[PDB]
Amino acid sequence: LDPLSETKCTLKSFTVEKGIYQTSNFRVQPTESIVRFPNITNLCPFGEVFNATRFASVYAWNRKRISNCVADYSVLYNSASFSTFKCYGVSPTKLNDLCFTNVYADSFVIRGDEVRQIAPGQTGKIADYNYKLPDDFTGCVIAWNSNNLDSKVGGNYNYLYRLFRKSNLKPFERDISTEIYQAGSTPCNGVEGFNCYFPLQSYGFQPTNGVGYQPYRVVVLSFELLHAPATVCGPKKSTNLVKNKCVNFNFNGLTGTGVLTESNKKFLPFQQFGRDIADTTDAVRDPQTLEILDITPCSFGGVSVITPGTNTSNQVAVLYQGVNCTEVPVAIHADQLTPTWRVYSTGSNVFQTRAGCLIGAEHVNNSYECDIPIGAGICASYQT
Amino acid sequence: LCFTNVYADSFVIRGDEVRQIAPGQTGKIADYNYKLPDDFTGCVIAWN
Amino acid sequence: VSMTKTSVDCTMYICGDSTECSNLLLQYGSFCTQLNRALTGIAVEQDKN
Amino acid sequence: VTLADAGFIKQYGDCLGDIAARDLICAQKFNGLTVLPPLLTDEMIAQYT
Amino acid sequence: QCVNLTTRTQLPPAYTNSFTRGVYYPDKVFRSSVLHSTQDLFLPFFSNVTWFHAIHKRFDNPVLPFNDGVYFASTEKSNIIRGWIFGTTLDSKTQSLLIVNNATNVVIKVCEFQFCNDPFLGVYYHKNNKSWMESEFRVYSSANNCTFEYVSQPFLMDLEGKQGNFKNLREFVFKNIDGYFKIYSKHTPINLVRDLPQGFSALEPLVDLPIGINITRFQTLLALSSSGWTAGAAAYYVGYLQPRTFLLKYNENGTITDAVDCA
Amino acid sequence: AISSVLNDILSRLDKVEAEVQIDRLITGRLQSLQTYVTQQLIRAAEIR
Ligand SMILES: *[C@@H]1O[C@H](CO)[C@@H](O[C@@H]2O[C@H](CO)[C@@H](O[C@H]3O[C@H](CO)[C@@H](O)[C@H](O)[C@@H]3O)[C@H](O)[C@H]2NC(C)=O)[C@H](O)[C@H]1NC(C)=O
Numbered sequence: 132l133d134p135l136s137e138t139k140c141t142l143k144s145f146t147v148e149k150g151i152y153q154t155s156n157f158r159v160q161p162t163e164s165i166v167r168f169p170n171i172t173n174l175c176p177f178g179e180v181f182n183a184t185r186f187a188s189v190y191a192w193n194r195k196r197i198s199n200c201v202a203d204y205s206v207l208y209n210s211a212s213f214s215t216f217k218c219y220g221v222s223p224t225k226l227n228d229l230c231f232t233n234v235y236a237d238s239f240v241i242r243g244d245e246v247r248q249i250a251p252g253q254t255g256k257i258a259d260y261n262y263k264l265p266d267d268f269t270g271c272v273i274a275w276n277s278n279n280l281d282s283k284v285g286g287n288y289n290y291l292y293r294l295f296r297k298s299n300l301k302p303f304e305r306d307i308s309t310e311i312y313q314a315g316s317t318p319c320n321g322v323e324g325f326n327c328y329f330p331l332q333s334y335g336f337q338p339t340n341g342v343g344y345q346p347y348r349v350v351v352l353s354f355e356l357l358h359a360p361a362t363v364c365g366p367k368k369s370t371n372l373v374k375n376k377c378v379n380f381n382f383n384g385l386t387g388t389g390v391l392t393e394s395n396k397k398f399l400p401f402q403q404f405g406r407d408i409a410d411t412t413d414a415v416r417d418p419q420t421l422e423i424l425d426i427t428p429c430s431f432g433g434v435s436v437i438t439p440g441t442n443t444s445n446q447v448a449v450l451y452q453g454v455n456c457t458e459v460p461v462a463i464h465a466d467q468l469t470p471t472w473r474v475y476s477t478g479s480n481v482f483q484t485r486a487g488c489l490i491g492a493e494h495v496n497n498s499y500e501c502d503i504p505i506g507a508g509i510c511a512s513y514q515t
Numbered sequence: 516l517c518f519t520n521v522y523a524d525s526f527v528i529r530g531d532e533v534r535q536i537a538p539g540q541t542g543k544i545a546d547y548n549y550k551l552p553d554d555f556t557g558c559v560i561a562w563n
Numbered sequence: 564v565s566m567t568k569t570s571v572d573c574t575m576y577i578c579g580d581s582t583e584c585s586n587l588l589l590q591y592g593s594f595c596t597q598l599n600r601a602l603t604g605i606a607v608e609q610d611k612n
Numbered sequence: 613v614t615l616a617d618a619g620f621i622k623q624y625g626d627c628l629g630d631i632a633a634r635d636l637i638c639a640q641k642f643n644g645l646t647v648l649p650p651l652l653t654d655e656m657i658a659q660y661t
Numbered sequence: 662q663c664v665n666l667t668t669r670t671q672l673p674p675a676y677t678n679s680f681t682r683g684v685y686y687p688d689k690v691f692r693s694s695v696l697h698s699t700q701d702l703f704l705p706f707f708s709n710v711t712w713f714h715a716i717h718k719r720f721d722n723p724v725l726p727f728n729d730g731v732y733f734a735s736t737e738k739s740n741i742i743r744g745w746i747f748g749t750t751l752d753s754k755t756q757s758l759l760i761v762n763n764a765t766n767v768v769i770k771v772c773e774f775q776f777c778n779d780p781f782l783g784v785y786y787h788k789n790n791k792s793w794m795e796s797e798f799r800v801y802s803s804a805n806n807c808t809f810e811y812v813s814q815p816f817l818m819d820l821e822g823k824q825g826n827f828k829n830l831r832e833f834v835f836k837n838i839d840g841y842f843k844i845y846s847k848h849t850p851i852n853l854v855r856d857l858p859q860g861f862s863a864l865e866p867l868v869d870l871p872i873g874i875n876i877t878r879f880q881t882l883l884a885l886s887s888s889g890w891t892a893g894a895a896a897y898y899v900g901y902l903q904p905r906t907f908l909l910k911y912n913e914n915g916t917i918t919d920a921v922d923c924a
Numbered sequence: 925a926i927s928s929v930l931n932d933i934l935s936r937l938d939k940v941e942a943e944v945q946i947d948r949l950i951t952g953r954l955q956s957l958q959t960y961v962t963q964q965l966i967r968a969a970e971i972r
C-alpha cells in the first residue's frame with residue numbers, strides 16, 4: 132500500500148518505533164522482450180535423417196551434421212511414432228526456445244531391448260563394444276520399431292552389431308575393423324580357428340520375432356549449447372534490437388533481464404559471450420548485426436524507510452540508497468518494479484545525499500543534533 | 516487417512532497416453548484435453 | 564575503529580533476476596532475513612564505534 | 613590507506629562500458645552486495661579530532 | 662605412387678626447450694583484465710620438445726606417438742610443412758585422418774588409408790619458366806572407407822623463396838577427445854636462424870572435426886630421378902600436452918597475455 | 925547443478941527438472957552467505 136505498511140510487514144508488527152528500517156530493494160522491471168537469433172530460414176533436413184530409405188549398422192553408425200538451418204523440435208517431439216524421445220541436458224519442450232552450436236545426428240539400428248543401453252552411463256555389449264555416449268552427454272536419444280520398414284521373414288542380416296572387442300570403446304568412437312578376435316589364450320592367423328571369431332554378427336531381424344527382438348531405428352542428437360556462436364536454432368522470429376532501455380533479452384537462448392549498450396570490448400572472431408567475475412554474461416555479440424553489446428542489470432538499490440514512531444505519526448520518508456536522484460524520477464511506476472507504492476514520485480522536497488536519493492523529507496540549512504541517522508553526515512527528525 | 520473433498524475424473528485414452536496423465540507432463544493429451552496441476556495430491560489409476 | 568558497512572540483499576545474491584528461484588528460497592523462510600539483521604547489527608555498530 | 617567503495621554514489625557512466633570491465637566493485641554491486649557510507653564523514657571526524 | 666627416399670645423412674636426435682609456448686584459449690568465452698585458473702591438456706612450460714629439420718642433406722618425417730594430444734610448431738620459409746597423418750595402425754586395418762595443404766586447396770579426410778613408408782609431397786624446382794611446380798603426392802596408395810571429407814575453396818599459395826633465417830612461426834595444438842579432433846593455431850612473423858623462439862603468444866581455436874577414430878600416433882608431411890633431391894630448409898618441433906592447471910592472464914583487450922604453469 | 929548460471933538452467937529445463945538444479949544453487953549460495961555473515965560477525969568483534 133505505502134512504505135509504512137511495507138515496514139509494518141517487514142518487521143511483522145502493526146506499530147513501528149522511531150527509526151530507519153531496511154525494506155525490499157527497488158528494481159526497474161523489463162519494458163519489453165527482445166529476441167535475437169541468426170537470420171537463417173531453411174528448415175533442418177530431418178526427412179533425410181529420420182526418413183532415409185535405409186539406416187546404418189550399429190557397428191558402423193553414420194554421423195550426419197546439422198548446420199545453417201532452423202529446427203522445429205515440436206514436429207518431432209509431438210509425434211506418436213517415437214517409442215522413446217529421452218533428453219539428457221534439456222527438457223524436450225525447451226528445444227524450440229533454444230540455440231545450438233554444432234549438432235550431430237548419429238543414425239543406426241539395434242534390437243528393441245538395447246535402446247536402454249544407448250543412454251549415457253550405460254554398459255552391456257552395445258554400450259561397451261559399438262556405441263558409447265559420454266557421462267556428461269547433452270542431447271536426446273530417439274527410437275522407434277522399424278519392423279515394417281526394414282525386416283524380412285528369413286531375417287534382414289544387413290544390420291550388424293559387434294560381439295567381440297580387445298577393450299571397450301571410447302565415447303563417440305566408431306570401429307569399422309574386421310580383425311579376428313581370439314577368445315582362447317592361443318594366438319591365431321589366417322581367417323578362422325577354434326575359440327577364434329569374426330568380431331561382427333548380424334541380427335536375426337524377422338517380422339515374426341517377439342517385441343524386443345524386432346529392429347529399432349535410433350537417432351541420437353548430440354548438440355552443444357549456450358557457450359559459442361550458434362548455427363542451428365529454434366523456430367522463433369527475432370524482434371527488433373533496442374539499446375539504453377531495460378529489456379527481457381534472449382540471444383541464442385541466453386535469456387536475461389538487462390539494459391543493452393554499444394560496447395568497445397574487442398571480441399576475437401570465435402567468441403559470442405563475455406563473462407563477469409561472478410560467472411555471468413556481461414557482453415554478447417548480436418547474431419544478426421555482428422556488434423558487441425554490453426549487458427548491465429536494471430537500476431536497483433536498497434530502500435530504507437525513515438519514520439517517527441507509529442505512536443507519533445504515520446508520515447514517512449524514503450531513502451533510495453546508493454542512487455543518483457536522476458534515477459528516482461526515472462523509476463516512474465508507469466511500468467513494473469519490485470515496489471509498488473510509486474506515490475512518492477511527486478517530490479518537490481527531494482534531496483541528493485551522499486548515501487542516495489532521499490524523498491519525503493525537507494532539507495533544512497539549520498543543523499541539529501543527530502536523531503535518525505541517514506549516513507554521510509545527514510540525519511532526519513520529525514519537527515514543527 | 517482422511518479426505519476433505521474427493522473428485523474422480525473418469526475418461527478413456529490410448530495405452531501410450533497413460534504416461535501423459537501424470538502431473539508435470541505434456542504432449543497433446545496433457546496440453547489440449549486433460550491437465551493435472553504441478554502440486555497434484557491424488558492417484559492415477561488405469562487398465563486396458 | 565571501524566570497517567566497511569555492508570548490506571547484502573540475499574534474495575538478489577541467491578536468486579538473481581528469477582521469480583522461480585525466489586519462490587524456492589521462501590521454503591527456507593527466515594534465512595533471507597536473519598542475515599540482513601546480522602549485517603545491519605554490524606553496520607549500526609560501525610557508527611557506534 | 614587505499615579505500616574501496618566508500619558508498620558515495622554510483623551512476624552507470626562509471627560502471628558500464630569502460631569502467632564495467634576493470635572493476636570488482638561492479639561485480640559486487642550487480643549481485644546485491646552493497647557498501648554503505650559511515651554516519652560521520654572524514655570531515656566530521658577531522659572536526660572532532 | 663610410392664618410393665623410399667633414401668639419400669640422406671645420419672644425425673643423433675635433437676631436442677629443444679619450449680620456454681612458455683603452447684598455451685591456447687581454453688573455451689570460446691571473452692574475458693578481460695582477469696586472472697583465470699583452468700585445467701586442460703596444456704604443453705608444460707620449459708619442457709623438452711623433440712626437434713626436426715630439413716637441410717640442403719636432412720629430411721626427418723618420422724612416425725611419432727600422439728598420446729593425450731600434441732603441440733606442433735614450425736619455424737619456416739617457402740611453405741615446406743604441408744600436413745599431417747594421424748591414426749592407430751596407419752595401414753587400413755583401421756581408419757586414419759589425413760590433413761594436407763597442397764598447392765591449391767586444403768584437404769581434410771578420414772579413411773581406412775594405406776599410407777606410404779616415407780610419405781611426402783613434391784615440387785619441380787626452378788624449371789625454366791621461373792615457377793616452382795607441385796607435381797608429387799606420395800601419401801596413400803588406397804583410401805577404402807571415407808567417413809569424413811572436406812576440401813577448401815581453392816587458392817594459390819607460393820612454393821618459392823630463399824632467405825638466411827626463418828620468416829614464419831606457425832604453432833598448432835591437436836587434441837582427440839570423445840570422438841572430436843580439435844585444432845588450435847597461431848601465426849607470428851619472425852627473424853630466427855635455427856631455434857624455437859623464446860616468447861609468449863596464445864593459440865586461438867580453429868576447427869573441430871567429428872572424426873570418431875582412435876589416434877595413437879601421427880606423422881608430418883614435408884614438401885620435397887626417384888631419389889637424389891634438395892630439401893628446402895624448414896624446422897619443426899613436437900611437444901606433448903599434459904593435464905595441468907594453468908593461471909591465464911587476460912589484458913584489457915581480452916587477449917591471453919601471460920600465463921603461470923601451476924606445477 | 926548443470927550450470928553455475930541460474931538462467932542457463934531455466935533456458936534448458938522445465939519446472940520439474942529445474943527445481944532439482946535450482947535447489948542445489950540455493951543450498952550452496954545460502955551456505956556461502958552464512959559463512960560470510962559468520963566471518964563478518966567474528967571480524968566485527970575484533971574491530972569492536
Ligand atoms: C587405440 O590404439 C592403441 C594402440 O593400438 C590401443 O592401445 C593398445 O591396446 C592393446 C590391448 O590392451 C595393448 O595390447 C598389449 O597390452 C599389454 C601392454 O600394453 C600387454 O601385456 C599385452 O600382451 C598386449 O600385447 C597395446 O599395448 C596398446 N597399445 C597402446 C600404444 O596403447 C588403444 O586401446 C586404442 N584405443 C581404443 C579406444 O580403441
Ligand SMILES: *[C@@H]1O[C@H](CO)[C@@H](O[C@@H]2O[C@H](CO)[C@@H](O[C@H]3O[C@H](CO)[C@@H](O)[C@H](O)[C@@H]3O)[C@H](O)[C@H]2NC(C)=O)[C@H](O)[C@H]1NC(C)=O
Binds near residue numbers: 812
Ligand atoms: C590438391 O589436391 C586435390 C585432391 O586432394 C586436387 O583436387 C582434384 O582436382 C581434380 C582436377 O580439378 C579433380 O578432377 C575432377 O574435377 C571435376 C569433378 O567434377 C571434373 O570436371 C573432372 O573431369 C575431374 O573428374 C579431382 O576430383 C579433385 N579431387 C577432389 C577430391 O576434389 C587438387 O587438384 C590439388 N591441387 C593442386 C594445386 O595440386
Ligand SMILES: *[C@@H]1O[C@H](CO)[C@@H](O[C@@H]2O[C@H](CO)[C@@H](O[C@H]3O[C@H](CO)[C@@H](O)[C@H](O)[C@@H]3O)[C@H](O)[C@H]2NC(C)=O)[C@H](O)[C@H]1NC(C)=O
Binds near residue numbers: 912913914
Ligand atoms: C588495445 O588495442 C588498441 C588498438 O590497437 C591499443 O590502443 C593503441 O595504442 C597505441 C600505442 O599507445 C596507439 O599508437 C599511437 O599513439 C599516438 C596516438 O594516440 C600516436 O602519436 C603514435 O604515433 C601511435 O600511432 C594507438 O593509437 C591506440 N589505438 C587507438 C586507435 O587509439 C591499446 O593499447 C590496446 N590495449 C592493450 C591493453 O594492449
Ligand SMILES: *[C@@H]1O[C@H](CO)[C@@H](O[C@@H]2O[C@H](CO)[C@@H](O)[C@H](O)[C@H]2NC(C)=O)[C@H](O)[C@H]1NC(C)=O
Binds near residue numbers: 457483623
Ligand atoms: C547525477 O547525475 C547527473 C547527470 O544526470 C549529474 O549531473 C552532471 O554533473 C556534471 C558535473 O557537475 C556535469 O558536467 C554534467 O553536465 C551533469 N549532467 C546532468 C544532465 O546533470 C550529477 O552530478 C549526478 N549527481 C551525483 C550526486 O552523482
Ligand SMILES: *[C@@H]1O[C@H](CO)[C@@H](O)[C@H](O)[C@H]1NC(C)=O
Binds near residue numbers: 178179181206210212
Ligand atoms: C517421417 O515420415 C513420417 C510418415 O511416414 C512423418 O510422420 C514424419 O513427420 C517424418 N519425419 C521427418 C523427420 O521427416
Ligand SMILES: *[C@@H]1O[C@H](CO)[C@@H](O)[C@H](O)[C@H]1NC(C)=O
Binds near residue numbers: 419
Ligand atoms: C543477417 O542478415 C544480414 C543481411 O540482412 C547479413 O549481413 C547477415 O549475414 C545475416 N546473418 C547471418 C548470421 O548470416
Ligand SMILES: *[C@@H]1O[C@H](CO)[C@@H](O)[C@H](O)[C@H]1NC(C)=O
Binds near residue numbers: 442
Ligand atoms: C501511545 O499513544 C496512545 C494515545 O494515542 C497512548 O494511550 C499510549 O499510552 C501511548 N504509548 C506509548 C508507548 O507512548
Ligand SMILES: *[C@@H]1O[C@H](CO)[C@@H](O)[C@H](O)[C@H]1NC(C)=O
Binds near residue numbers: 707708709
Ligand atoms: C631435457 O633434456 C635434457 C637432456 O639434454 C635433460 O638433461 C633435462 O633433464 C630434460 N628436461 C626436461 C624437463 O625434460
Ligand SMILES: *[C@@H]1O[C@H](CO)[C@@H](O)[C@H](O)[C@H]1NC(C)=O
Binds near residue numbers: 788789790
Ligand atoms: C613450363 O610450364 C609449361 C606449362 O605451363 C610446361 O608445358 C613446360 O614444360 C614448363 N617448362 C619447364 C622448363 O618446366
